[PDB]
Amino acid sequence: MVQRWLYSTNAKDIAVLYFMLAIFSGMAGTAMSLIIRLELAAPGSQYLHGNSQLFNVLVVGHAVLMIFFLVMPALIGGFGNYLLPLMIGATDTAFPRINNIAFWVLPMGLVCLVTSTLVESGAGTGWTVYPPLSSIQAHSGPSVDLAIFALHLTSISSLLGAINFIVTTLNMRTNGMTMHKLPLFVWSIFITAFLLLLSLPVLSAGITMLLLDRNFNTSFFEVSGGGDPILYEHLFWFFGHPEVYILIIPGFGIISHVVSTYSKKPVFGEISMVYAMASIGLLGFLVWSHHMYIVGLDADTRAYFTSATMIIAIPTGIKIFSWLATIHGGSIRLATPMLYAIAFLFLFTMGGLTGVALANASLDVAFHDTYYVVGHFHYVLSMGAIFSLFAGYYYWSPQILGLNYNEKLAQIQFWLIFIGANVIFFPMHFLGINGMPRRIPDYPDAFAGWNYVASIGSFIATLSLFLFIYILYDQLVNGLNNKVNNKSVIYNKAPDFVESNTIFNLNTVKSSSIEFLLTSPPAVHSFNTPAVQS
Amino acid sequence: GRIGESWVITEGRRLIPEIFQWSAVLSVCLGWPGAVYFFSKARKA
Amino acid sequence: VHFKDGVYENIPFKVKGRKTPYALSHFGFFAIGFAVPFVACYVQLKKSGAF
Amino acid sequence: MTHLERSRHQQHPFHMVMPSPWPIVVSFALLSLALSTALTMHGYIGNMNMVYLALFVLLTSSILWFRDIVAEATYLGDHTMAVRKGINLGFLMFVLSEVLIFAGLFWAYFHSAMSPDVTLGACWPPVGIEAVQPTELPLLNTIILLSSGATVTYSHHALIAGNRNKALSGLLITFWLIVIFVTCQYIEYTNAAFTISDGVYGSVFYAGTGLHFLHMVMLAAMLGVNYWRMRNYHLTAGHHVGYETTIIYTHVLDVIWLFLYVVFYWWGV
Amino acid sequence: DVPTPYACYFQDSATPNQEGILELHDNIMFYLLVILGLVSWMLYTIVMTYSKNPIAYKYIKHGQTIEVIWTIFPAVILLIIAFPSFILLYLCDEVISPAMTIKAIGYQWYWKYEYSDFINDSGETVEFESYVIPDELLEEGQLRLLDTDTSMVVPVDTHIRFVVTAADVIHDFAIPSLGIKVDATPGRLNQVSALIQREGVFYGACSELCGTGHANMPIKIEAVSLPKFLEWLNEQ
Amino acid sequence: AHDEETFEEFTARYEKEFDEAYDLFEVQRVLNNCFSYDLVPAPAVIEKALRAARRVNDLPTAIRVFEALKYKVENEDQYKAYLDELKDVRQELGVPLKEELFPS
Amino acid sequence: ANKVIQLQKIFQSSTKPLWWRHPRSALYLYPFYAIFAVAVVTPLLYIPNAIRGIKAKKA
Amino acid sequence: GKGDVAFITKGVFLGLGISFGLFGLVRLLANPETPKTMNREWQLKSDEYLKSKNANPWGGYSQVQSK
Amino acid sequence: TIAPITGTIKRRVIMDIVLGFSLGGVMASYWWWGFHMDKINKREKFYAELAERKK
């Protein structure tokens, strides 16, 4: 069993391990979100008495852990590693040791990130780890060096997975997959793996410049000595916007597939949707400085960037319009991944509208480093990527794990996370437009109500994850009994109207991709022979 | 259509009760800050 | 060697044939996952102030 | 042929790799390297002995990985034409990622150069720093890369042709040519008026040229491995993907050196 | 000026720039609420009339007419949204002929204000470091964590342009009432303008991370009339 | 063909597609592909569908035609003026409806 | 020295794994296992000395 | 099927009550003392000072928020 | 005797997007006129009274 889980150059048994580190790190990151929002519940020094450096350490831990160790593994690494060979008919991926070392250099980035928060009080900068806040004069210690070595390791993991994905869907397709016949999640993982190797080299260059002007006495951003800290803002956000487009594009793919298969309708114009997604990918590099409208750019380049971020906004709009068009006229079977897919549309349209409220370089002077921004990204990142993650798990894990979950517990988990996460991030907009800045331990006690309402909501959003943990346990020890004893839903695609039950038992699964034709838990050599297509 | 109750009436009957429940679900999906402000001591409760 | 396939031979957890209940391992995994920021908070609150 | 001796094979051209213990070991070594070089930069451990052995164990694990891949590629014989096109496109995308690191370094140079700060004297190069003139030693180690490219391309086209005494002579003289390049580059470093700490000019100049320096010493190690397995008859006349890989790498290294050399030695002085 | 409990709107107007920002945000929200209402109405109508639909129109997969209208409608709305923000962005940088200048240089966890237009006829520039009152020496009516023992004081009805910088970590000079927010990076001076249209206090906070003392770093700007400001500047 | 289909081409194509079916899967398949279009089919289509369900000799797909049609139509005046056009085919073929078969 | 087909005839015809299949592959992996175990277990005894904050004894 | 919409709304409201109670008894152990400017007696002085200098003149300026 | 009944989803969606336009329009129209003209009229009343009180 050591050669099946430690050496293990097989893309099915790497994705399970990706998912295990994903659920582990997501638990750690939401423990940090619970501690943050538990300390910010009331003015005056709460549970952590004084000690604002500990709060800075906790918020950079929450941000960077839950971004680079939950969302990026459980969307790129886990789901791409399990499904990208299993949708295009490759037996499994090309460069298999490369996506084994990508997984196995993830948790060492995790353990050095964990031990970075213990030595010499700690790295507190936020996830956008800035100079001269992080240079050796204003921040001494080996903490932020381990904190950015974690980013070096996660950066290396995601690039190796990107090269792996790109070559394994550019060469090892099956017999009939043409250049435009792939299912849309394959196209999302394709374009995301391009944006990774087109973006994160610039990130790793900038943060190793930060490391060797911390410790090797150079002067990239040490300003008394020639440099400037604006160059780090450029070199960071040139990755920082493609990073979240990387984090959200497989979400678009997952949501496209689940609304295609739970409404008994193909997606409305798949070719225009993949053109919109590819243009979003190749356009997301040209708007990198919409996070830098304040620092002192000219009004002319600010005018250019506030022109270009709205043309960023339009193809996401035509994607959401195509989603409304492909759920219109269907036969919508409201199961638990379809509920997450329906909630994702509203809860991401809301965040995108407040995002284009932010995108005006005129209007960003009233909203920068302000809880309005937190209300925007904790919509489009949290609700977006993780409602797509839940609509990935609750839709795919009966096929992958081979154990059917409980259904009513899944629906109370959806409604609990929906209510208890809509009550958190909605008062953040009122805190933003009333004037609350970011990263404060706590605040002048005027706006003392909305923080309390958000803190009474975060406990609901944590209790729903505890119920998700119990859903995992009830799936793992009562899978076959939930197959038999009528607690679950068994057929995700219902029989059509004029079709008999004796005729539905002939053609059981009416899929459009390969994945729901493989047996529950699939064979380790699934495609012995190629899977033909016309 | 041609013969039957007219399409204006038979789709108004379908959609006019839907507008009020849409307004209810939107007024309680965006209007609960009013309900939490209504009971607090800032409104001289 | 093709490793043999089943319903419980796809995951690293052994579930059916054990000596201890599965709830021990399955909830201790997320116990240590949920308690790593608490031990970070404790080691940071004994280094500066009190606790 | 018979079905009975057709179903005794792979049934698809792609590679099925047996479980190998060289992601886990080199990932262990990468973790130990990262933590030990984060730990010795602040005086927690006494010497650089431990970062030395961590770098050494990373190097020897990765060379054992490349030993496993040359044994699997030419002894067990799995690299058919589909897998060959796959690893070729993978190396192309990896080098496309390397040139973007070089583009980030050029962005740093351009941003601090064409808008010079008021503490540099508002002139690029800054006051007092005697810049390196581009015509003495930079001209030799920018013509030596073109000569290296010419001899590695005739060694390639002699390897495809069939002669051994020419295809080996070109590889030997391109190895000694670029190691002469590396040695005169170190000669350029060890007598220069500015260090890596002397201002932002020395910082970004030494960052760019040192990254290209490390890239071509890795190229020299790659070409030494390729010359060894050309002498030991591994390289064929139509299955040399591990040599087309390194000639693609050295030609793109030549063109990124000329970009770096022009805007680091002519425009920037 | 000051924040209020359970508020859900802007700290109100003082400057023409903040009035323009408020009008622009209400125009943008007026154009956004149509889109939010029709998106929510489409989602509600679809998921409550096609859930009880037994058959699915699976032979509707493209139509060019409605496709190009829903891709040309957001371009139209985004052009109408971007049409006045260009006017605001190109007028909020117009700092032709200000009256007096301030420097607002921000150190580690305090600010240091200085006036050096030479009408103080003691001769010198005038500076003051502007520490926060620590939250046990508050005395029966003083706003917590955003009060200051030594306020900056500006005049009414004169254009004032102040530059800002730091001597350390990147700070931000940020008042939401005056609509002024500009990152004080330690390398460059950054100037912004103001025309305060009424007397009174205006509060703000640092809105970039400084480290430990990020919360204990406020901005307090009292705006007084011009003869009282001349008297204060001559006396101080 | 992504070009549109007029009503006469629709009814001729589907009459020649209901004539050719021989199994039960084929009759239910072409019935689903006829009903899941946008229009409701004229009774020249559906009396041929009733004959094609009679040829395979099974009853309930000659009843679910009528219930799928009741879900198709826009009111019940169209349904009644429809059902008195398929009266005698329903008589001599002997199929029932739903509301008289399951009174609730 | 044209010793590729003898190595191929050896490498195809064995049961041992690939990184142990060569004749001289005992001199390449035993000292590697020793120095790798040493080099990766050794910073995990210096990490609690760093958590406690006690630096080195240098100079 | 068969009244499970009732079971799931019972589970949702039970989860809201459970999270409310656990937030309450986690809130109970936080910190004994308040910042001294939290009760209403300080707030009346702190907005008398505001109406002395007519801050927020048309919008809301009164700060009490305490019982 | 029966007419061909065709085109119900087209009539339904062009009846639905028009009501979606007008519904979002009346919500946003209430927003702009009611709330924003309330704030603007309060502000202009205060500024007129201030410029009168400073005579």
Ligand code: HEA
């Ligand atoms: C991945 C992105 C992400 C997500 C999901 C969240 C979600 C949460 N965050 Fe936030 N946060 C950030 C990234 C994120 N955050 C970033 C980047 C910053 C900026 C930091 C800075 O600039 O300094 C920030 C800042 C930030 C603030 C603002 C503080 C400040 O800067 O002043 C707060 C306060 O409430 C907060 C707490 C929370 C809480 C309570 C949640 C809760 O929603 C958590 C509950 C979430 C879940 C329950 C999701 C389910 C979890 C699973 C593990 C599911 C497993 C399923 C699969 C694997 C399929 N974080």
Ligand code: HEA
């Ligand atoms: C997941 C990654 C992600 C995604 C997808 C987005 C989506 C968008 N974001 Fe966001 N954003 C962040 C990640 C992301 N953001 C992060 C991490 C921060 C904080 C960084 C920090 O620490 O400072 C941030 C904050 C942030 C800023 C920085 C402000 C500041 O810090 O000062 C800006 C600036 O322009 C912005 C704008 C937008 C816009 C216009 C979109 C658009 O892409 C949204 C597109 C969606 C829609 C437009 C809605 C759907 C469309 C329709 C319904 C059609 C009709 C719509 C129109 C006609 C407009 N958001």
Ligand code: CUA
């Ligand atoms: Cu200065 Cu925050």
Ligand SMILES: [Cu+2]
């Ligand atoms: Cu961005």
Ligand SMILES: [Mg+2]
């Ligand atoms: Mg900022």
